[PDB]
Amino acid sequence: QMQLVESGGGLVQAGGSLRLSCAVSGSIFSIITLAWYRQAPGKPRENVATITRGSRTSYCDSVKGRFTISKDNAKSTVYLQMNKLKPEDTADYYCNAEGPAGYWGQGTPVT
Amino acid sequence: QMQLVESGGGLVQAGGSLRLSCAVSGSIFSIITLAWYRQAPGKPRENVATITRGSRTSYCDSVKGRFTISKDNAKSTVYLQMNKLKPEDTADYYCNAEGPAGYWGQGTPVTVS
Amino acid sequence: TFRRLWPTIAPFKAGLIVAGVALILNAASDTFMLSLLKPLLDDGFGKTDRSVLVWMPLVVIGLMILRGITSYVSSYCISWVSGKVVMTMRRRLFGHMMGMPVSFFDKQSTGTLLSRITYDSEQVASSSSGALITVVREGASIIGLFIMMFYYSWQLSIILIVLAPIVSIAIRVVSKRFRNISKNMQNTMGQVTTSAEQMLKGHKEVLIFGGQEVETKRFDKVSNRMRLQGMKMVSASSISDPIIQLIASLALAFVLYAASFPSVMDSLTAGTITVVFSSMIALMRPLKSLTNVNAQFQRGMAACQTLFTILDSEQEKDEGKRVIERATGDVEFRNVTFTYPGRDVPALRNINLKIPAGKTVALVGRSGSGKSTIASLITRFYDIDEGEILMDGHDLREYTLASLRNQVALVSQNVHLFNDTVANNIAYARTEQYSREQIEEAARMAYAMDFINKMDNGLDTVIGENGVLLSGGQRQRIAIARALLRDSPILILDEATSALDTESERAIQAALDELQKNRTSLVIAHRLSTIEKADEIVVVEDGVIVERGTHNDLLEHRGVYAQLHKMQF
Amino acid sequence: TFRRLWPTIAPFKAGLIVAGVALILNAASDTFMLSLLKPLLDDGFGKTDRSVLVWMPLVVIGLMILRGITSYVSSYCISWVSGKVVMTMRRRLFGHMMGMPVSFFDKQSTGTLLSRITYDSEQVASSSSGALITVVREGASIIGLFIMMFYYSWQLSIILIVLAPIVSIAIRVVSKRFRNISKNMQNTMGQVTTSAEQMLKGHKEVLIFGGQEVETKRFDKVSNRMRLQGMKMVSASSISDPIIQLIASLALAFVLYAASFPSVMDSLTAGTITVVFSSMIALMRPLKSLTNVNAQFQRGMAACQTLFTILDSEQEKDEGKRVIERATGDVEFRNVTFTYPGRDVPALRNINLKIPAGKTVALVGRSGSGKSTIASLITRFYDIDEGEILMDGHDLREYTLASLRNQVALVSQNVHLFNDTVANNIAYARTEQYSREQIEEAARMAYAMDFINKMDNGLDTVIGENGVLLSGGQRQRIAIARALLRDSPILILDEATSALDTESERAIQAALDELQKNRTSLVIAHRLSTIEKADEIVVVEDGVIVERGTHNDLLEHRGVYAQLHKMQF
Ligand SMILES: CCCCCCCCCCC[C@@H](O)CC(=O)O[C@@H]1[C@H](O)[C@@H](CO[C@@H]2O[C@H](CO[C@]3(C(=O)O)C[C@@H](O[C@@H]4O[C@H]([C@@H](O)CO)[C@@H](O)[C@H](O[C@H]5O[C@H]([C@@H](O)CO)[C@@H](O)[C@H](O)[C@@H]5O)[C@@H]4O)[C@@H](O)[C@@H]([C@H](O)CO)O3)[C@@H](OP(=O)(O)O)[C@H](OC(=O)C[C@@H](CCCCCCCCCCC)OC(=O)CCCCCCCC)[C@H]2NC(=O)C[C@@H](CCCCCCCCCCC)OC(=O)CCCCCCC)O[C@H](OP(=O)(O)O)[C@H]1NC(=O)C[C@H](O)CCCCCC
Ligand SMILES: *[C@@H]1CC(=O)N(CC/N=C2/CN3CCN4CCN(CCN(CC3)CC(=O)OO2)CC(=O)OOC(=O)C4)C1=O
Ligand SMILES: *[C@H]1CC(=O)N(CC/N=C2/CN3CCN4CCN(CCN(CC3)CC(=O)OO2)CC(=O)OOC(=O)C4)C1=O
Ligand SMILES: [Gd]
Ligand SMILES: [Gd]
């Protein structure tokens, strides 16, 4: 039974950039699909970014060309970098490992 | 000898929709790549539409929810449907088969008013 | 010791004793035949009366009748205990072959299994049969020959009774030498036969470089070496007989001389001397066969020990005690890790796959690596290395395998069909328990009666080999028809078909829509329909549960199945 | 006819005729022994103590010396001719499959060619030699015995000469019965072995249904049947002898009675009947073995025709006349279609590849379908089905293979290495043209002196099978050493190294750097570098050139390459 812990920021001015991190400990970090999901206070959860065994990255749409994601080969940690922030992006962000029906982290709300 | 013939329209209104066709002869039509480029008066060629062995669709970053590629398996014919036209899209559209080093039809330019 | 193995053969005492007592006679016939020679010479053509030898022809025909009759009698009833021992050993060996773990069938010896049951058992049976005929027929020939030599002579028999064991020692010494010479020739043959194989192994690499001209010469060398080895074989082989018979003839010359050196001998009539010479010029078959019989005892014993080694291998484990009735439950995996005996890189890392009750989980895999073996742990073909495959709260190691493998129904493309009645294959191994009224409904329920009633005999049809060759797509239909009648709670559809039958595969899919209304099923998937209705999709990428969700919650999460949904779209 | 079978052993009169002259003596000595047995009875033991009793003790050893020596000479100098005909026939037979079209090695008979040649040749001359010495020394025995029998009696052997055809026909008819009975047992063994092999194939499918017991039932009923067939074998076989033995015994009884019915007897000297009887019973080994020599002539002709079915099969087409000095041309495909001999689905549909000289093309299709075999057409292994593989402005079929296959250089990792010195492999089929001065720097330019020096001798280590076993990646380096020495105009990589090896790769990618500087090269690319630096990448989706073009213009055009670049991102 693994666990993954999130580190992020709080409230920043709009139009800036931020970086969220999730350290996943307790499994084979190289192959397992890592991902980042977000959830509005009213709207349910949804996908944001994904990264694969060969680091084939993939992203949502409303933030395409604006976000980035990668993972350290041995550090066992996934970085999600956010650029050109918008007021609509104020939401609770979560990291995830092994698909959308597996493990989830505590996450953090970001304004 | 494998060859292709392209048919298209002419001057049309801005923001409209059209369908341009291309029929291929001497082809194993079900498996080869098929594609549609566009060539501006100032800019060189660059693919916009692509359909594939398994029948799949890919387009320029700009062309998204804008163009539609389709094929009729029996007719040996492919089509590009254009919606929400823009003045900057006035160019000459080229049918193509079997990769960029493949084949090239006549191509039919279309003018956006 | 030797006495200990008699009870193994105790039930065949009648056959083997008849063999012995009709074998002694076949030897006694020749002995009494030479005895018949002495009156013919001493009195038949020694004395004037012609009636002295009219007694011969009837008695010689009678003795040859009694030799042929016991030849046939003792060959047969030594080829009936030869058969009712090879048969029982083969049957006791195949009954300890259907209980070995599937790993023993890892293709290292798949073809050999028919040979192990046959060639080695034929070897032991034939060797023991031949050995027993030649230590008793020959053994009592020798006893009979020397008994009739004594009754006709004294000094010749005494001289012969001493100088013959010297011929015997000669026979063995010329043999042991031949065996020692031939020992390494198997290695020589292997070495020489390797090279021809290498050259025809790379024929492409010969054409592609224009090098026929420098391969004719190499096979010239190899053929010359092979021929010279064969000539060495022959030259060393043909000094056995022309030497032992020379020793024997020198012994016979000593016999004649030291049987006629003084005037003490020559009391022999013209008949007794012919009888002594006859018996001995006859005695060469026994004195050689009885002496080379030890070439078979050790060889037969070697074959028997080969069979006892192949029998004493590893039984499939059975260290379980529990018995399950019908396990509807949340079968699970937990931290499983597993590597095939004989390989290095593990196939499965830490797994948390979880089949729920009622629901079904689908396995999809891009490279085809690591899927199939999750169906060979949930039925305990291979014991897992590190983990615990829960099933209602227990490890699968603790269930009696005959009561665990009684829960899993394995539908497949490549299911096996025993060459028997269709009414059997749809209720295989349980025809006593299940009546044909169940099959009548079941074979309809899987939509397969349409493929059966078309045949010649219907459900009496021979369905396997030497049978009607049921089509591969319809073997899957029969796999469903079978797994319906069992109505087991854990299902393992392999769906590795890829092959398509128009409307027929549609009827197979409709059947599966009846097969899995229940029955928690771990279906390894290659078809759009099964994944579409799948309840929890679990994708492995070559070693480990990579992504796992449900189709409607997956395809938005680009993951690895979506970028595989594109590839089989 | 038989007159024209002479020249095949033309240089072998010497040994064969010496064997014959020393093989008739082996029968004449057998005759002389019994001839000397005649005087030992009447004159020797009648009224004398010597002159027979002194001759015989040493003359018997003399004749057995003359018997053993002739047996050795006959066997050895007939085996010389046997082996020297086996060697030449097998040499021709092998030399007529280095010129066999590559279809012949389609795995149908790849492993069975060595077995074919060795067993067929070891059988064709063993049977012929056995028949030859079984028609001379088994045929001189009869003539010698009959001579020595007429010389001793004028009428007692007339009955034997009249009677002998009865014995001959009886032996032949009994043997023919046995052979005829032995016919259907091939079918029976097939029927039972097929069932046995089908029985334990589905081990997985027997365990999973819990049907072990109802399986041992079927095997016990198969073993019962097969034992019954074995007993039928033995009962049929064992009565071949005891009936011809009875027939010959009836012959002996008829003779024995006939020697005493009228007053014609009493002209039999007391020992004359002894030698007549002995010469008759000794005549059973020849007369019985002489009838059954047709059973070896038939086997010899059967094996001869068996090999003649192969020594004259289809021969790789040569129907060209032109020659090449250097293929500095642009290989052209056109509309080529090709389906393997023995296959139905077309492996290659229409094609328009136009590999230009001095540049490369990368065959990269994920399906692993069709690219591997656009290297067996340009080099004329499996010829095209429709189309024309133009080379340097001409077709392939207009070109003699001798230089066509000398142009291309089929670099790979699977390059079979001949069991010779390494610096023989580098210049294989050309050892005279290349002096080791060239070979040293050629190993250098293909990066090989490094792993070559670490060997025991230098560029000198026998390296092939049963050699040193170079590493899989060093075999690629030595394949480059060959292809770089030859200086070919058309290069065909195969990039079988899907599993790359680090460090070796540096020197491999470095070596392949020098090889593909010019030298137009069809490269079956799989590694990012070759595809990236190629000039016209070409994909093949399981039947056809799907998407073709240069890389940077191809990634932009998704089609099938971008979707195949991502899988190997
Ligand atoms: C001073 C002055 C003195 C003067 C000197 C005169 C001396 C003369 C010397 C030379 C004589 C020469 O002219 C004759 C000779 O020598 O030839 C032998 C013979 O050809 C050969 C074959 O053996 C025969 O055949 C059968 C076995 O054969 C096989 C097999 O098939 O099983 C084949 C092969 O196996 C094969 O091997 C292959 C290969 O290896 C070879 O490398 C393989 O390819 C295969 O093997 C595997 O494979 C298979 C299958 O798998 C398939 O693949 C298996 O089947 C297999 O088992 C095997 O596993 C193949 O099968 C082989 O290897 C062998 C292997 O060892 C084991 O397997 O087995 C046996 O019959 P059965 O019962 O078995 O059916 C035979 O025995 C018998 O009792 C014969 C029986 C036959 C029944 C007929 C009865 C009468 C019918 C009349 C006919 C009339 C028709 C018109 O009559 C009787 O008894 C009745 C008694 C007499 C009754 C009369 C009395 C009242 C009147 C046996 N027959 C004999 O011995 C005949 C013997 C007679 C012996 C009988 C009594 C002796 C005296 C009689 C007194 C009466 C006087 C009036 O000779 C004479 O007549 C002597 C003349 C008398 C002079 C004395 C008077 C003073 O043996 C040897 O061979 P050599 O030449 O190399 O040495 C040969 N040499 C010797 O034996 C002895 C040697 O001389 C040493 C002599 C030194 C002696 C010193 C002390
Ligand atoms: C990435 C960028 C973004 O904002 N997304 C969602 C946009 N909002 C959508 C509203 N959607 C509500 C119901 N969705 C569940 C069904 N979705 C298909 C129908 N969607 C319109 C109604 C079209 C969309 O794909 O996204 O639409 C499937 C889905 O999960 O998409 O999310 C969603 O809001 C729930 C992005 O995807
Ligand atoms: C999609 C449809 C369209 O009109 N595009 C052009 C957008 N402008 C691009 C500027 N590009 C300049 C250099 N190009 C030649 C190399 N291109 C790769 C780098 N491009 C950015 C610089 C990336 C683009 O795809 O488009 O670029 C290749 C190329 O597509 O050429 O277009 C071009 O303008 C020249 C679209 O992208
Ligand atoms: Gd949505
Ligand atoms: Gd661009």
PDB file of all heavy atoms in Angstrom, chain B residues 33-51:
ATOM      1  N   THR B  33      -1.678   5.767 -46.077  1.00  0.00           N
ATOM      2  CA  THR B  33      -1.990   7.075 -45.534  1.00  0.00           C
ATOM      3  C   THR B  33      -2.612   7.933 -46.621  1.00  0.00           C
ATOM      4  O   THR B  33      -2.384   7.719 -47.809  1.00  0.00           O
ATOM      5  CB  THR B  33      -0.729   7.743 -44.996  1.00  0.00           C
ATOM      6  OG1 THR B  33      -0.129   6.895 -44.015  1.00  0.00           O
ATOM      7  CG2 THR B  33      -1.037   9.083 -44.364  1.00  0.00           C
ATOM      8  N   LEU B  34      -3.429   8.892 -46.206  1.00  0.00           N
ATOM      9  CA  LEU B  34      -4.029   9.866 -47.102  1.00  0.00           C
ATOM     10  C   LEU B  34      -4.021  11.203 -46.388  1.00  0.00           C
ATOM     11  O   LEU B  34      -4.106  11.254 -45.161  1.00  0.00           O
ATOM     12  CB  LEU B  34      -5.443   9.443 -47.469  1.00  0.00           C
ATOM     13  CG  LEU B  34      -5.418   8.236 -48.388  1.00  0.00           C
ATOM     14  CD1 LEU B  34      -6.790   7.826 -48.753  1.00  0.00           C
ATOM     15  CD2 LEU B  34      -4.676   8.619 -49.634  1.00  0.00           C
ATOM     16  N   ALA B  35      -3.916  12.292 -47.139  1.00  0.00           N
ATOM     17  CA  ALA B  35      -3.727  13.558 -46.452  1.00  0.00           C
ATOM     18  C   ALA B  35      -4.128  14.716 -47.345  1.00  0.00           C
ATOM     19  O   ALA B  35      -4.341  14.564 -48.549  1.00  0.00           O
ATOM     20  CB  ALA B  35      -2.282  13.726 -45.994  1.00  0.00           C
ATOM     21  N   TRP B  36      -4.193  15.889 -46.727  1.00  0.00           N
ATOM     22  CA  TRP B  36      -4.534  17.128 -47.407  1.00  0.00           C
ATOM     23  C   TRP B  36      -3.663  18.235 -46.840  1.00  0.00           C
ATOM     24  O   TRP B  36      -3.721  18.517 -45.638  1.00  0.00           O
ATOM     25  CB  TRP B  36      -6.014  17.469 -47.223  1.00  0.00           C
ATOM     26  CG  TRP B  36      -6.923  16.737 -48.139  1.00  0.00           C
ATOM     27  CD1 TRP B  36      -7.152  15.401 -48.168  1.00  0.00           C
ATOM     28  CD2 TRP B  36      -7.737  17.307 -49.160  1.00  0.00           C
ATOM     29  NE1 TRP B  36      -8.057  15.096 -49.149  1.00  0.00           N
ATOM     30  CE2 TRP B  36      -8.431  16.254 -49.774  1.00  0.00           C
ATOM     31  CE3 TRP B  36      -7.947  18.607 -49.614  1.00  0.00           C
ATOM     32  CZ2 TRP B  36      -9.319  16.459 -50.819  1.00  0.00           C
ATOM     33  CZ3 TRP B  36      -8.828  18.809 -50.651  1.00  0.00           C
ATOM     34  CH2 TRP B  36      -9.503  17.742 -51.243  1.00  0.00           C
ATOM     35  N   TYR B  37      -2.854  18.842 -47.702  1.00  0.00           N
ATOM     36  CA  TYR B  37      -2.028  19.987 -47.358  1.00  0.00           C
ATOM     37  C   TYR B  37      -2.701  21.266 -47.829  1.00  0.00           C
ATOM     38  O   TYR B  37      -3.663  21.244 -48.595  1.00  0.00           O
ATOM     39  CB  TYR B  37      -0.643  19.885 -48.002  1.00  0.00           C
ATOM     40  CG  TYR B  37       0.181  18.688 -47.598  1.00  0.00           C
ATOM     41  CD1 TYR B  37      -0.131  17.420 -48.053  1.00  0.00           C
ATOM     42  CD2 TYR B  37       1.296  18.837 -46.791  1.00  0.00           C
ATOM     43  CE1 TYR B  37       0.624  16.335 -47.696  1.00  0.00           C
ATOM     44  CE2 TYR B  37       2.056  17.758 -46.426  1.00  0.00           C
ATOM     45  CZ  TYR B  37       1.717  16.507 -46.883  1.00  0.00           C
ATOM     46  OH  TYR B  37       2.478  15.419 -46.526  1.00  0.00           O
ATOM     47  N   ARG B  38      -2.163  22.397 -47.389  1.00  0.00           N
ATOM     48  CA  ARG B  38      -2.563  23.682 -47.938  1.00  0.00           C
ATOM     49  C   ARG B  38      -1.321  24.528 -48.153  1.00  0.00           C
ATOM     50  O   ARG B  38      -0.385  24.490 -47.350  1.00  0.00           O
ATOM     51  CB  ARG B  38      -3.577  24.401 -47.036  1.00  0.00           C
ATOM     52  CG  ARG B  38      -4.073  25.743 -47.538  1.00  0.00           C
ATOM     53  CD  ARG B  38      -5.122  26.312 -46.594  1.00  0.00           C
ATOM     54  NE  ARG B  38      -4.570  26.622 -45.279  1.00  0.00           N
ATOM     55  CZ  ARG B  38      -3.927  27.747 -44.987  1.00  0.00           C
ATOM     56  NH1 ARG B  38      -3.752  28.675 -45.920  1.00  0.00           N
ATOM     57  NH2 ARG B  38      -3.457  27.947 -43.764  1.00  0.00           N
ATOM     58  N   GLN B  39      -1.313  25.275 -49.252  1.00  0.00           N
ATOM     59  CA  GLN B  39      -0.152  26.041 -49.686  1.00  0.00           C
ATOM     60  C   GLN B  39      -0.593  27.479 -49.917  1.00  0.00           C
ATOM     61  O   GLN B  39      -1.388  27.752 -50.824  1.00  0.00           O
ATOM     62  CB  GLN B  39       0.456  25.438 -50.953  1.00  0.00           C
ATOM     63  CG  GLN B  39       1.847  25.938 -51.283  1.00  0.00           C
ATOM     64  CD  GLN B  39       2.465  25.190 -52.447  1.00  0.00           C
ATOM     65  OE1 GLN B  39       1.778  24.470 -53.172  1.00  0.00           O
ATOM     66  NE2 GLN B  39       3.770  25.355 -52.631  1.00  0.00           N
ATOM     67  N   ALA B  40      -0.090  28.384 -49.086  1.00  0.00           N
ATOM     68  CA  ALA B  40      -0.379  29.800 -49.197  1.00  0.00           C
ATOM     69  C   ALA B  40       0.448  30.428 -50.314  1.00  0.00           C
ATOM     70  O   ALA B  40       1.469  29.874 -50.728  1.00  0.00           O
ATOM     71  CB  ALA B  40      -0.090  30.496 -47.870  1.00  0.00           C
ATOM     72  N   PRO B  41       0.016  31.580 -50.835  1.00  0.00           N
ATOM     73  CA  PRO B  41       0.848  32.278 -51.829  1.00  0.00           C
ATOM     74  C   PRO B  41       2.227  32.639 -51.309  1.00  0.00           C
ATOM     75  O   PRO B  41       3.187  32.662 -52.090  1.00  0.00           O
ATOM     76  CB  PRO B  41       0.023  33.531 -52.165  1.00  0.00           C
ATOM     77  CG  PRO B  41      -0.999  33.644 -51.072  1.00  0.00           C
ATOM     78  CD  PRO B  41      -1.278  32.249 -50.629  1.00  0.00           C
ATOM     79  N   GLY B  42       2.359  32.921 -50.016  1.00  0.00           N
ATOM     80  CA  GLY B  42       3.646  33.262 -49.445  1.00  0.00           C
ATOM     81  C   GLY B  42       4.277  32.138 -48.647  1.00  0.00           C
ATOM     82  O   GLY B  42       5.505  32.043 -48.567  1.00  0.00           O
ATOM     83  N   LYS B  43       3.447  31.278 -48.051  1.00  0.00           N
ATOM     84  CA  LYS B  43       3.994  30.233 -47.201  1.00  0.00           C
ATOM     85  C   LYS B  43       4.106  28.915 -47.957  1.00  0.00           C
ATOM     86  O   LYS B  43       3.343  28.660 -48.894  1.00  0.00           O
ATOM     87  CB  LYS B  43       3.119  30.034 -45.961  1.00  0.00           C
ATOM     88  CG  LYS B  43       2.958  31.283 -45.111  1.00  0.00           C
ATOM     89  CD  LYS B  43       1.942  31.069 -44.002  1.00  0.00           C
ATOM     90  CE  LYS B  43       1.741  32.338 -43.189  1.00  0.00           C
ATOM     91  NZ  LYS B  43       1.361  33.492 -44.049  1.00  0.00           N
ATOM     92  N   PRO B  44       5.054  28.055 -47.572  1.00  0.00           N
ATOM     93  CA  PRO B  44       5.177  26.747 -48.230  1.00  0.00           C
ATOM     94  C   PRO B  44       4.111  25.764 -47.774  1.00  0.00           C
ATOM     95  O   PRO B  44       3.201  26.126 -47.023  1.00  0.00           O
ATOM     96  CB  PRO B  44       6.579  26.286 -47.821  1.00  0.00           C
ATOM     97  CG  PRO B  44       6.803  26.939 -46.501  1.00  0.00           C
ATOM     98  CD  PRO B  44       6.124  28.279 -46.585  1.00  0.00           C
ATOM     99  N   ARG B  45       4.217  24.517 -48.226  1.00  0.00           N
ATOM    100  CA  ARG B  45       3.237  23.502 -47.870  1.00  0.00           C
ATOM    101  C   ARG B  45       3.301  23.169 -46.384  1.00  0.00           C
ATOM    102  O   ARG B  45       4.349  23.276 -45.741  1.00  0.00           O
ATOM    103  CB  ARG B  45       3.465  22.228 -48.679  1.00  0.00           C
ATOM    104  CG  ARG B  45       3.002  22.291 -50.113  1.00  0.00           C
ATOM    105  CD  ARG B  45       3.569  21.118 -50.878  1.00  0.00           C
ATOM    106  NE  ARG B  45       3.228  21.149 -52.293  1.00  0.00           N
ATOM    107  CZ  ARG B  45       3.737  20.319 -53.196  1.00  0.00           C
ATOM    108  NH1 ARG B  45       4.608  19.392 -52.827  1.00  0.00           N
ATOM    109  NH2 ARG B  45       3.375  20.415 -54.467  1.00  0.00           N
ATOM    110  N   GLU B  46       2.155  22.760 -45.844  1.00  0.00           N
ATOM    111  CA  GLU B  46       2.069  22.245 -44.482  1.00  0.00           C
ATOM    112  C   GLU B  46       0.764  21.480 -44.350  1.00  0.00           C
ATOM    113  O   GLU B  46      -0.303  22.016 -44.661  1.00  0.00           O
ATOM    114  CB  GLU B  46       2.147  23.373 -43.448  1.00  0.00           C
ATOM    115  CG  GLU B  46       0.809  23.981 -43.062  1.00  0.00           C
ATOM    116  CD  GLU B  46       0.302  24.968 -44.097  1.00  0.00           C
ATOM    117  OE1 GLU B  46       0.948  25.104 -45.157  1.00  0.00           O
ATOM    118  OE2 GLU B  46      -0.743  25.607 -43.852  1.00  0.00           O
ATOM    119  N   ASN B  47       0.852  20.233 -43.901  1.00  0.00           N
ATOM    120  CA  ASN B  47      -0.327  19.382 -43.834  1.00  0.00           C
ATOM    121  C   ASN B  47      -1.346  19.942 -42.853  1.00  0.00           C
ATOM    122  O   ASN B  47      -0.993  20.528 -41.827  1.00  0.00           O
ATOM    123  CB  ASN B  47       0.065  17.965 -43.423  1.00  0.00           C
ATOM    124  CG  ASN B  47       0.391  17.861 -41.955  1.00  0.00           C
ATOM    125  OD1 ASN B  47       1.093  18.705 -41.403  1.00  0.00           O
ATOM    126  ND2 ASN B  47      -0.130  16.833 -41.307  1.00  0.00           N
ATOM    127  N   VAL B  48      -2.626  19.778 -43.186  1.00  0.00           N
ATOM    128  CA  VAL B  48      -3.718  20.130 -42.296  1.00  0.00           C
ATOM    129  C   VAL B  48      -4.575  18.921 -41.946  1.00  0.00           C
ATOM    130  O   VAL B  48      -5.003  18.777 -40.796  1.00  0.00           O
ATOM    131  CB  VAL B  48      -4.587  21.265 -42.880  1.00  0.00           C
ATOM    132  CG1 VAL B  48      -3.755  22.520 -43.056  1.00  0.00           C
ATOM    133  CG2 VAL B  48      -5.219  20.858 -44.194  1.00  0.00           C
ATOM    134  N   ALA B  49      -4.835  18.038 -42.906  1.00  0.00           N
ATOM    135  CA  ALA B  49      -5.700  16.891 -42.681  1.00  0.00           C
ATOM    136  C   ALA B  49      -4.933  15.606 -42.933  1.00  0.00           C
ATOM    137  O   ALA B  49      -4.103  15.546 -43.842  1.00  0.00           O
ATOM    138  CB  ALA B  49      -6.925  16.946 -43.588  1.00  0.00           C
ATOM    139  N   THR B  50      -5.233  14.569 -42.156  1.00  0.00           N
ATOM    140  CA  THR B  50      -4.575  13.284 -42.340  1.00  0.00           C
ATOM    141  C   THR B  50      -5.499  12.166 -41.893  1.00  0.00           C
ATOM    142  O   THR B  50      -6.006  12.198 -40.771  1.00  0.00           O
ATOM    143  CB  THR B  50      -3.279  13.223 -41.543  1.00  0.00           C
ATOM    144  OG1 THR B  50      -2.527  14.419 -41.761  1.00  0.00           O
ATOM    145  CG2 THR B  50      -2.465  12.033 -41.975  1.00  0.00           C
ATOM    146  N   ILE B  51      -5.715  11.180 -42.762  1.00  0.00           N
ATOM    147  CA  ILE B  51      -6.442   9.974 -42.396  1.00  0.00           C
ATOM    148  C   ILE B  51      -5.541   8.790 -42.714  1.00  0.00           C
ATOM    149  O   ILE B  51      -4.635   8.879 -43.543  1.00  0.00           O
ATOM    150  CB  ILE B  51      -7.798   9.861 -43.114  1.00  0.00           C
ATOM    151  CG1 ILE B  51      -8.693   8.854 -42.397  1.00  0.00           C
ATOM    152  CG2 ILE B  51      -7.603   9.450 -44.542  1.00  0.00           C
ATOM    153  CD1 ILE B  51     -10.154   8.978 -42.742  1.00  0.00           C
TER     154      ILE B  51
END
